[PDB]
Design a protein around this ligand. Sequence first.
Ligand code: Y3
Ligand code: Y3
Ligand code: MN
Ligand code: MN
Lengths: 146, 146
Amino acid sequence: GLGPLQIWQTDFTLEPRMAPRSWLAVTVDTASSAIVVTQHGRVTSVAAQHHWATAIAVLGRPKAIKTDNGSCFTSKSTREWLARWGIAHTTGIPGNSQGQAMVERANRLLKDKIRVLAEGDGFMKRIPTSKQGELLAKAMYALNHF
Amino acid sequence: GLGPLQIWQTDFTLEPRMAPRSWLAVTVDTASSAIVVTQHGRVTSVAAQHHWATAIAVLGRPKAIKTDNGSCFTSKSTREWLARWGIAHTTGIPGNSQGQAMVERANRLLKDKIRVLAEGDGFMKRIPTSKQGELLAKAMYALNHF
Ligand SMILES: CC(=O)Nc1cc(S(=O)(=O)O)cc2cc(S(=O)(=O)O)cc(O)c12
Ligand SMILES: CC(=O)Nc1cc(S(=O)(=O)O)cc2cc(S(=O)(=O)O)cc(O)c12
Ligand SMILES: [Mn+2]
Ligand SMILES: [Mn+2]
C-alpha cells in the first residue's frame, strides 16, 4: 500500500496559563496530522523523553522524529534514548527552509484552544492547577477528533 | 458503513509494583480493542474522571462506557461528569453474565507485561518511582501496537 511515512515533528512551547508546569511538549504526526501534548515544569532531555514515551503509547513507534536544535533534543542522553528505541532523529532541511512549520502551527492552535476553553470556564489568567490536566486533554481531543 | 459501536469498558486494578500510585485505571475500546491505562494513588470519582479525560483525548468520545458498580463509577460526581460529556453509562447484563470480561482480560495481560518489563530492567519488586511512567507507557504500547 502507498501512504505517508511515519515521521513526527516535536517542539516545546511556553504557556504561562498552565504554570507551574507551563512547558508544553507538542508532537505532530505528519502522516495522520494527529497531535499529542504533555506538560512539563522544565525543558530538559528527560522531559522530551517522557513526552515521546507517552506519544509512542498513543501513536505507536515512528520511523523518525524531526526537531530543532534545542539542547534537550541534541544531548547525549536524548541521542541514546532514541537509539534505544531505534528511532532516527533528524532536523530541518536547508534551502531557506525553516524549522518545522506543521508543529509551529499546532503550537498556535493549541494555545488558542487552551485560551478559549479556559475563558469559557471563567479562568481569565492562570488555570487552577487541579483543573489543568482535564483542560489540556480537552484541548487535545478538540484538535484531533471531530 | 457497518462497524462496531464505540463502547468502552473501564475498571480499576491494584498493582503494588507501581506504588505509591498503584491503582491502574484500564479502559478497553471494544470497537478497536485499544487499551488505555493511567495510574492513580486512590480509587476515587475524581481519579475515574481524570482517566476518562485522558482516554477521550486518545481514543475520542465514546457513545457509552460499561463499568461495574464500584462507587467511583456510581457516585453523583461521576454521573454528572459523564452527563456533561453526553456519554451514556451502563453496566453488565444479567443472565448469569459477569461484569466485563474484555477489561478483566486486559487487567491480567497488563499486569503480566509490567512484570516482564520490570524484571528485564532488573526490578524484582517495586519499580522505582521515576521509572514508572515510561515503563507503563511501554506496556501500553506493547499491548496495542505491533
Ligand atoms: C517530513 C516532513 O516534515 N514533511 C513535511 C513537512 C511539512 S512542514 O509544513 O512542516 O514544513 C509539510 C509537508 C507537506 C507534505 S505534502 O503532502 O503536502 O506534499 C509532505 C511532507 O512530507 C511535509
Ligand atoms: C458492549 C460489549 O461489551 N460487548 C461485548 C462484550 C464482550 S465481553 O467479553 O467483555 O463480555 C464481548 C463481546 C463480543 C462481541 S463479538 O464481536 O464477538 O460478537 C461483541 C460485543 O459487543 C461484545
Ligand atoms: Mn523549539
Ligand atoms: Mn472493579
